[PDB]
Nucleic acid binder design. Structure first.
Ligand SMILES: [Mg+2]
Ligand SMILES: [Mg+2]
Ligand SMILES: [Mg+2]
Ligand SMILES: [Mg+2]
Ligand SMILES: [Mg+2]
Ligand SMILES: [Mg+2]
Ligand SMILES: [Mg+2]
Ligand SMILES: [Mg+2]
Ligand SMILES: [Mg+2]
Ligand SMILES: [Mg+2]
Ligand SMILES: [Mg+2]
Ligand SMILES: [Mg+2]
Ligand SMILES: [Mg+2]
Ligand SMILES: [Mg+2]
Ligand SMILES: [Mg+2]
Ligand SMILES: [Mg+2]
Ligand SMILES: [Mg+2]
Ligand SMILES: [Mg+2]
Ligand SMILES: [Mg+2]
Ligand SMILES: [Mg+2]
Ligand SMILES: [Mg+2]
Ligand SMILES: [Mg+2]
Ligand SMILES: [Mg+2]
Ligand SMILES: [Mg+2]
Ligand SMILES: [Mg+2]
Ligand SMILES: [Mg+2]
Ligand SMILES: [Mg+2]
Ligand SMILES: [Mg+2]
Ligand SMILES: [Mg+2]
Ligand SMILES: [Mg+2]
Ligand SMILES: [Mg+2]
Ligand SMILES: [Mg+2]
Ligand SMILES: [Mg+2]
Ligand SMILES: [Mg+2]
Ligand SMILES: [Mg+2]
Ligand SMILES: [Mg+2]
Ligand SMILES: [Mg+2]
Ligand SMILES: [Mg+2]
Ligand SMILES: [Mg+2]
Ligand SMILES: [Mg+2]
Ligand SMILES: [Mg+2]
Ligand SMILES: [Mg+2]
Ligand SMILES: [Mg+2]
Ligand SMILES: [Mg+2]
Ligand SMILES: [Mg+2]
Ligand SMILES: [Mg+2]
Ligand SMILES: [Mg+2]
Ligand SMILES: [Mg+2]
Ligand SMILES: [Mg+2]
Ligand SMILES: [Mg+2]
Ligand SMILES: [Mg+2]
Lengths: 159, 211, 145, 169, 296
RNA sequence: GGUUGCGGCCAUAUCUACCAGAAAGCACCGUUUCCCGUCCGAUCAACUGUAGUUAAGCUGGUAAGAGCCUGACCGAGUAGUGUAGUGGGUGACCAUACGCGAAACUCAGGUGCUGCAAUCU
RNA sequence: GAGAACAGAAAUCUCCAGUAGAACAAAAGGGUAAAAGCCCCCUUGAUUUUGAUUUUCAGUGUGAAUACAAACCAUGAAAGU
RNA sequence: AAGCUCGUAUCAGUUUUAUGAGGUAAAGCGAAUGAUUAGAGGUUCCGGGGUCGAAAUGACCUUGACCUAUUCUCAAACUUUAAAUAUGUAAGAAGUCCUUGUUACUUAAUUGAACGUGGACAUUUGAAUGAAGAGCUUUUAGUGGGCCAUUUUUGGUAAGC
């Protein structure tokens, strides 16, 4: 009958990336995690100990614990109509620092600056982001660039 | 005991190959796909004419074989067995099943029944190469083959030199230059890429410029 | 359905103004089969607001009819009259969000001389009524207002 | 060139394929022992064959690898038996050569009816200096083309010192 | 290479090349992984290794930590520094291994302050012993032996290096069973033999014997010893005093230098072929299809 | 700039065939008393740095080289696809509207970058 | 692939090539090359205490599994495991 | 149903921006595995026939396989590549920076780690749109045969299956 073991349906998920099998490079072990850090979760199939269940592949959570060979990650998972808190013991091989945050940290650190650069000068800042605006007017010149007239082309077969 | 072909015209199922998961499947009724002077050189037969599907459907191995024999028979008796090269372009890789038949619709997975080629719109089914002088004969051969197939197919005059991918004048440019050299019944083209040394080996009559 | 809610279009023939940015384009895109929209002229923003313009005031949909009603709720933003309001709308001012939200969605009638087409629910470009009909919106909305 | 891309003998491996274990093999061993001065190594059959009358892991043969001067005292000794004529095969593409003899008596060593008579497989493998490169642990590498042992190089080497013949084509 | 060998396009296309430093057969990544990764709850605490490598007759000791940009030398000592301390010959032997480890330990342990506390065994009787932590005070500098590709044999001289960095004050965790004078059939060290090696006793007694059985060889190898009138028996004091000299001043002198970086650079490019331009390559092809083609 | 020890990214670093490499280094290389390991001091261990060599390793350059990497309105706004209609068509299927948009192909350009430390005409 | 008496398609000896085309009880999929495969050396961590966690879920149980704490040991020169 | 604690507050079957995950559609097969049509050129001390033969590790044909570069065609349980739709996280006061306290953890180390004291910057304080507010607690009914349409889609010749 049906079958639904732990690593069920994961053939291509935990698979290894073309011409990237073998030892994991040492940078994966030199990276350093602190409680609060935001991490993305993705399984290294060659590292059977400490694997995320496949539900958590592609998922991003927060470190809550740092352990000898691992980090404890809390993921919010929705079951029924509600989220429940989930805690994952993952070896450092199945985790990386998420950049889901840099645009923020980089933007903060920058936002402080142009605020100083304003204040100190005599204000007028405006530092919220804004959506793509529509385009302004413009004058396109014809010089070197007279318009080429095209028409639709007849039916033809090649074969 | 063949069901009428109407029961498998359409592509209702993901392809079902002969595989190690299938295994007990009958032979294709079509089995030779190149008749005529297949040995012929490329320069010999410049005219290509296609029999071309205008439908998304399935052709049985049985109808490929029957059509095969139709076009080949007509062609050789009107114009000679070495007058042309017929190529069947379509192989019946898709296994059709049958729920042969107490028990009802219980456990209904069928057994292999026969084979079909799955065929697109604009997908070429037959290809022929000849002497220009023999066009009409060839075209009539594919016309008679049509009546062996379900669905609309329509015969199309090729732009290309025989079974080549080059339009006739382009094949002519390469040939009357050095660039082209004979092989079995196809052709090899000189590349500007790779070892200069053993590029010269092949294609000696290049590396001039002229005639 | 959600987008129609967020644009405040929760019943047939009612309408609202929208400031066009990438982040609302994509809203407009998701609802093209249910709406008709375009670029309104001064004349029709003016006659929309003079005729069918209502503030939202402690909810309670209140007709515009006197300028003190406006100044009491939008004064904080400059904007102390009905033509001030219009002006914030048409020029998409720095306070278009507060100004525009102030306006209850407009309740329009069916077009008076009709839709001009046999079938409404295909694109304006296919002889239907939905989608961006650009400046042809003014003829529709006037016929509806 | 030519400084010390000389042509030493890598090692000599004598081999007795006695398709059986038991007494006969431990006699085949004794031969190689006294003949090499070294204690020979035994080889188990790789699979069963039954028409060869052997079983997997039986102990089926003895052989021994010999290096330096000791390998020449024996090569020469066998080469004598071969009357200093090998053949144009015998020499491998990667520059080794081997021959066989039957009756080891034909290289010193008395008869002794309690040991019997055995045939031997001689296999001489050649190399030059700098061969360590391939055999060592760290920075293992491969000898450059123009330093590899070749058939011509070995035959000519053979034809010269020894002054023996090659024969055939 | 043979015609029937020789690689197909598809072989080459799917080939997964190993790490460079494996293709070079220089680095065991399995061991490195385990040498270098730190306890995650010890955060940015470097995990220092004691790298000991042997060239065809130079000994290299570096104390090394790791960084994803690359590793980091804290300190480095070489047995070719030993002429500075009164050792001229045989600087690839067990006692040069010892000396250098001692040199390396002393040097770093200095520039870390743990200099005057943690002297390590000053006596040296080849007693088996790790440097113990001073009650109330800084723990010793801890360091792990990176042997590299060296086989572990009981007697290997990589462990000579180990003995002297440990004798010199470093905490380098280790057992005793790869030191010369470890007895095979009994869990027992004879430190009398291990003392002997630290002071090159085996080299010396080897000279004494070659003296009066075969002076042909004694002058080939051991030439230098003759040439400097160092007949064996003094070899211990040689090394006994090296130890002294080393502890007295390990603080690493660089070579004076002569000629600058710019200058070493200048002459080296004289011998460095330079890549060609596309144009230059084009005109070699063109050149070739005038000759090899145009019917000579 | 060369080189070595430890490296990071792990082919622009790999593969095939040629050639060039000063100085140092590395290497090959000599030895078998001693620790140590072998059928074999080939590997592994030790000892000399003496006796010998750039042949190989190594490094670099060559090649209308194989591979790999990068780019392009090269192919292609193609294939596929989200949304729409009381659109076409017996049907199989297919056009159109508002969007998203490949892969192969073709051509061009490239062939390791770099951290710590020591050393070198 | 090329080589060596009896020796043959298949016995045992050697060199070259070899990205895994093998092997890892078992189905199949994933994984793995100075290994996770093959050969050898030492062993009982297949142990002790009691919690937390992931899958199945009701976020019950059971199975199975993960990462720690507190012991006691194994191995290795060691980091470690 | 009963409410309860609060209220510009926090909220969202939506977009945008930034940053992940994925192996379906398509595609591919002169790329791996597996299938498949055709020739062409090679290679045998070595698979078989046959002519010459005393034989040959002989020569010549012959047909096989294998190799090289080509060629037509395919995959639910094949694949280097690889969408669209769908999908995880982030867009601040529970924030950012400076100073330097606590410990039995951890470091060679007042090193770190975690929690803090004191100090500096307010609403363009950090995208859009919306918000008849938001959060929270108890308790209890009925239900636990479902069926249909567009699209994806399995079995079946098919079905108002
Ligand atoms: Mg199943
Ligand atoms: Mg386990
Ligand atoms: Mg369909
Ligand atoms: Mg079906
Ligand atoms: Mg039935
Ligand atoms: Mg019945
Ligand atoms: Mg059944
Ligand atoms: Mg069945
Ligand atoms: Mg027809
Ligand atoms: Mg709006
Ligand atoms: Mg009117
Ligand atoms: Mg009228
Ligand atoms: Mg009317
Ligand atoms: Mg109508
Ligand atoms: Mg009206
Ligand atoms: Mg030389
Ligand atoms: Mg027998
Ligand atoms: Mg091959
Ligand atoms: Mg190719
Ligand atoms: Mg690998
Ligand atoms: Mg190891
Ligand atoms: Mg030199
Ligand atoms: Mg001995
Ligand atoms: Mg030696
Ligand atoms: Mg050694
Ligand atoms: Mg050279
Ligand atoms: Mg090297
Ligand atoms: Mg190339
Ligand atoms: Mg579509
Ligand atoms: Mg329709
Ligand atoms: Mg398996
Ligand atoms: Mg390893
Ligand atoms: Mg048990
Ligand atoms: Mg229960
Ligand atoms: Mg349980
Ligand atoms: Mg799948
Ligand atoms: Mg697929
Ligand atoms: Mg497909
Ligand atoms: Mg297809
Ligand atoms: Mg593709
Ligand atoms: Mg294929
Ligand atoms: Mg093609
Ligand atoms: Mg979303
Ligand atoms: Mg969402
Ligand atoms: Mg609002
Ligand atoms: Mg309210
Ligand atoms: Mg209830
Ligand atoms: Mg209930
Ligand atoms: Mg109930
Ligand atoms: Mg019921
Ligand atoms: Mg419906």
């Amino acid at each position: 009958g049906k079958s639904h073991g732990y690593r069920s349906r994961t053939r291509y998920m935990f698979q290894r990336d073309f011409r990237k099998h073998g030892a994991v490079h040492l940078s994966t072990y030199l990276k350093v995690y602190k409680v609060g850090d935001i991490v993305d979760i993705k399984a290294n199939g060659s590292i059977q100990k400490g694997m995320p269940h496949k539900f958590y592949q592609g998922k991003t959570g927060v470190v809550y614990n740092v352990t000898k060979s691992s980090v404890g990650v809390i993921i919010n998972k929705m079951v029924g109509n509600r989220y429940l808190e989930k805690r994952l013991n993952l070896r450092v091989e199945h985790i990386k620092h998420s950049k889901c945050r840099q645009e923020f940290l980089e933007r903060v650190k920058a936002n402080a600056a142009k605020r100083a650069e304003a204040k100190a000068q005599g204000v007028a800042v405006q530092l919220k982001r804004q959506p793509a605006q529509p385009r302004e007017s413009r004058i396109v010149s014809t010089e070197g660039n007279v318009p080429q007239t095209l028409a639709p082309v007849p039916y033809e077969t090649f074969i | 005991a063949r069901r009428p072909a109407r029961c498998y015209r359409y592509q209702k199922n993901k392809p079902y190959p002969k595989s190690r998961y299938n295994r007990a499947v009958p032979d294709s009724k079509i089995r030779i796909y190149d008749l005529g002077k297949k040995k012929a050189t490329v320069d010999e037969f410049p005219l290509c004419v296609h029999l071309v599907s205008n439908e998304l459907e399935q052709l049985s191995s049985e109808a490929l074989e029957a059509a095969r024999i139709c076009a080949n028979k007509y062609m050789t008796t009107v114009s000679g067995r070495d007058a042309f090269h017929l190529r069947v372009r379509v192989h019946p890789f898709h296994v059709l099943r049958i729920n042969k038949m107490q028990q009802g619709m219980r456990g209904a997975w069928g057994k292999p029944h026969g084979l079909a080629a799955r065929v697109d719109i604009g997908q070429i089914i037959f290809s022929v190469r000849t002497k220009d002088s023999n066009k009409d004969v060839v075209v009539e051969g594919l016309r008679r083959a049509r009546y062996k197939f379900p669905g609309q197919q329509k015969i199309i005059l090729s732009k290309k030199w025989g079974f080549t991918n080059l339009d006739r004048p382009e094949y002519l440019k390469k040939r009357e230059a050095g660039e082209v050299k004979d092989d079995g019944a196809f052709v090899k083209f000189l590349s500007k890429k790779g070892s200069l040394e053993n590029n010269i080996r092949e294609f000696p009559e290049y590396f001039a410029a002229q005639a | 359905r959600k987008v129609l809610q967020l644009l405040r279009l929760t019943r047939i023939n009612s309408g609202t103004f929208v400031k066009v940015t990438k982040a609302t384009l994509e809203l407009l895109k998701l609802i093209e089969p249910y709406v008709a929209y375009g670029y309104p002229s001064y004349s029709t923003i003016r006659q929309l607001v003079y005729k069918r313009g209502f503030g939202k005031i402690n909810k309670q949909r209140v007709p515009l009819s006197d300028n003190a009603i406006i100044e009491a709720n939008l004064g904080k933003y400059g904007i102390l009259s009905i033509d001030d309001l219009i002006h914030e709308i048409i020029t998409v001012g720095p306070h278009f969000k507060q100004a525009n939200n102030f306006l209850w969605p407009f309740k329009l009638s069916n077009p008076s001389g009709g839709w001009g087409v046999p079938r409404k629910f295909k694109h304006f470009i296919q002889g239907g009524s939905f989608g961006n009909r650009e400046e042809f919106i003014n003829k529709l909305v006037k016929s509806m207002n | 060139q030519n400084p010390m891309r000389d042509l030493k003998i890598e090692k000599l491996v004598l081999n007795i394929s006695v398709g059986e274990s038991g007494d006969r093999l431990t006699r085949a061993s004794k031969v190689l022992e006294q003949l090499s001065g070294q204690t020979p190594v035994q080889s188990k059959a790789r699979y069963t064959v039954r028409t060869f009358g052997i079983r997997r892991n039986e102990k089926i043969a003895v052989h021994v690898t010999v290096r330096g001067p000791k390998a020449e005292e024996i090569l020469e000794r066998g080469l004598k038996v071969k009357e200093y004529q090998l053949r144009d095969r015998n020499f491998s593409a990667t520059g080794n050569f081997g021959f066989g003899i039957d009756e080891h008596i034909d290289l010193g060593i008395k008869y002794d009816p309690s040991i019997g008579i055995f045939g031997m497989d001689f296999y001489v493998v050649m190399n030059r200096p700098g061969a360590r490169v391939t055999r060592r642990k760290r920075c293992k590498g491969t000898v450059g083309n123009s330093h590899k042992t070749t058939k011509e190089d070995t035959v000519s080497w053979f034809k010269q010192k020894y002054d023996a013949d090659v024969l055939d084509k | 290479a043979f015609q029937k060998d020789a690689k197909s396009s598809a072989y080459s296309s799917r080939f997964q090349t190993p790490f460079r430093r494996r293709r070079e057969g220089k680095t065991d990544y399995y061991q490195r992984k385990r040498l270098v990764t730190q306890h995650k709850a010890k955060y940015n605490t470097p995990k220092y290794r004691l790298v000991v490598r042997f060239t065809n007759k130079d000994i290299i000791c570096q104390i090394i930590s790791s960084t994803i940009t690359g590793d980091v030398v804290l300190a480095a000592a070489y047995s070719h520094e030993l002429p500075r301390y009164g050792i001229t010959h045989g600087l690839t032997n067990w006692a040069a291994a010892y000396a250098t480890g001692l040199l390396i330990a002393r040097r770093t342990l200095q520039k870390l302050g743990l200099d005057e506390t943690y002297k390590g065994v000053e006596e040296v009787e080849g007693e088996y012993e790790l440097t113990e932590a001073v009650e109330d005070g800084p723990r010793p500098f801890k360091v792990f032996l990176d042997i590299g590709l060296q086989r572990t044999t009981t007697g290997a001289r990589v462990f000579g290096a180990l003995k002297g960095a440990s004798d010199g004050g470093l905490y380098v965790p280790h057992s005793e069973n790869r030191f010369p004078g470890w007895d095979f059939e009994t869990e027992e060290i004879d430190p009398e033999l291990l003392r002997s090696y630290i002071f090159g006793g085996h080299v010396s007694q080897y000279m004494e014997e070659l003296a009066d059985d075969d002076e042909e060889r004694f002058s080939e190898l051991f030439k230098g010893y003759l040439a400097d009138d160092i007949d064996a028996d003094s070899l211990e004091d040689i090394y006994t005093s090296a130890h002294e000299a080393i502890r007295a001043d390990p603080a690493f002198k660089p070579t004076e230098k002569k000629f600058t970086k710019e200058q070493y650079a200048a002459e080296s490019k004289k011998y460095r072929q330079t890549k060609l331009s596309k144009e230059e390559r084009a005109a070699r092809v063109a050149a070739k299809i005038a000759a090899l083609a145009g019917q000579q």
